[PDB]
Amino acid sequence: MISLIAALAVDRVIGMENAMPFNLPADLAWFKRNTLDKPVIMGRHTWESIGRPLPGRKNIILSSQPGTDDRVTWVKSVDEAIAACGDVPEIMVIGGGRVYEQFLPKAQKLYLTHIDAEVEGDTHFPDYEPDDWESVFSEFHDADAQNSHSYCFEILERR
Amino acid sequence: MISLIAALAVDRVIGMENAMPFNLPADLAWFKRNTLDKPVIMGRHTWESIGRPLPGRKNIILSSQPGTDDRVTWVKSVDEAIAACGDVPEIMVIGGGRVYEQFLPKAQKLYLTHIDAEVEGDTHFPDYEPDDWESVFSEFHDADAQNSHSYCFEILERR
Ligand SMILES: CN(Cc1cnc2nc(N)nc(N)c2n1)c1ccc(C(=O)N[C@@H](CCC(=O)O)C(=O)O)cc1
Ligand SMILES: CN(Cc1cnc2nc(N)nc(N)c2n1)c1ccc(C(=O)N[C@@H](CCC(=O)O)C(=O)O)cc1
Ligand SMILES: [Ca+2]
Ligand SMILES: [Cl-]
Ligand SMILES: [Cl-]
């Protein structure tokens, strides 16, 4: 099963290349807990923003360009990405934009972080009709000394 | 000598009610490089914000209240804070507002990180007379894949 995991600001805006103007360690922890011990698929800009292989996860980079680094797996197509994953219960797609567009149709689950921040931006997480998806978990959190903005974690199941 | 090290947004904002919305690892790396192996003096709110003792430095907390952590040194006066640093060439004051106000008069150098961001602030860096300070180093950088805003490092020496 394929799942997409993303942190969205108001209007579904997501990052493009530069880091997003928010500071949410709670969301990085959530991100870690849900992707650890699973394969993760990401595009080239996400890989540069991360800056190193995520430990405890098989790192698959989907891109047209060449593999700089030998520590990760570089694939040129969606099909190739999937295969690199092997037979596992759940595959995590971690962005960016175009990557989410390509895998959404195949997605059965969504782990989203709705952040209360207005950011100006070009990219948006793909439009999804929440009535083709069932909201199974929702938990709100206020901003605090460590987290810059309020945020809400949500898991959706493809109905 | 005593030096003050701070990150200031536009209008000299140094803090907000919650965590600042900047994701700036380069500023934390400039912060570590300039404070490593030196004693650091901070207020209680900054201490609670960091979360742990900073590695490789002598952590001194200036507070009227009683200490809650055995790994650091708790002091109640500026005079006490200084004495606790001993005989070192340079003592670093890392915030927040009130602590900076108390130590400014005694500081000979400022290491500042100007961040290009407009925010509503809670606390601000004290007003300094740009005429009493000599900029001896400046370095601008744009936002990038890992840094959310553009910023500029500057070191000033009292004239
Ligand atoms: C820029 N980027 C991609 C990123 C960031 N937040 C997201 N948050 C969510 N919810 N979803 C994503 N797909 C997402 N992706 C990053 C950057 C750093 C780390 C990171 O360092 N993660 C550590 C945890 C925090 C740490 O070690 O400093 C980990 O083990 O996953 C993860 C993703
Ligand atoms: C909230 N806080 C206070 C903070 C943050 N940025 C500042 N930036 C500047 N330039 N000056 C300050 N006084 C400043 N203070 C922090 C928070 C974290 C760390 C911190 O973990 N720094 C690590 C380096 C970063 C890392 O290894 O993740 C260190 O070793 O100094 C420091 C100060
Ligand atoms: Ca100069
Ligand atoms: Cl990407
Ligand atoms: Cl403080």
Curated annotation (Swiss-Prot), chains A, B:
Write down the SUPFAM superfamilies for this protein, in alphabetical order: Dihydrofolate reductase-like
- Gene Ontology biological process terms from the UniProt entry: 10-formyltetrahydrofolate biosynthetic process; dihydrofolate metabolic process; folic acid biosynthetic process; folic acid metabolic process; one-carbon metabolic process; response to antibiotic; response to methotrexate; response to xenobiotic stimulus
Q: Where does substrate bind?
A: 5, 27, 52, 57, 113
> CDD domains from the entry?
DHFR
Q: Does the keyword Mitochondrion apply?
A: no
Q: Does the keyword Transmembrane helix apply?
A: no
Cellular component (GO) terms are: cytosol
**Variant or mutagenesis effect after changing residue 20 to L:** Increases catalytic rate 2.5-fold. Increases catalytic rate about 7-fold
Spell out the molecular function terms from Gene Ontology. dihydrofolate reductase activity; dihydrofolic acid binding; folic acid binding; methotrexate binding; NADP binding; NADP+ binding; NADPH binding
Q: Which residue intervals define the domain DHFR in the entry?
A: 1-158
Reaction catalysed by this chain? Answer: (6S)-5,6,7,8-tetrahydrofolate + NADP(+) = 7,8-dihydrofolate + NADPH + H(+)
> Do you know which NCBIfam families this protein is assigned to?
PRK10769.1
Q: Which family does it belong to?
A: Belongs to the dihydrofolate reductase family.
What is the protein's name according to its record?
Dihydrofolate reductase
Q: Top-down, what is the taxonomic lineage of the species of origin?
A: Bacteria, Pseudomonadati, Pseudomonadota, Gammaproteobacteria, Enterobacterales
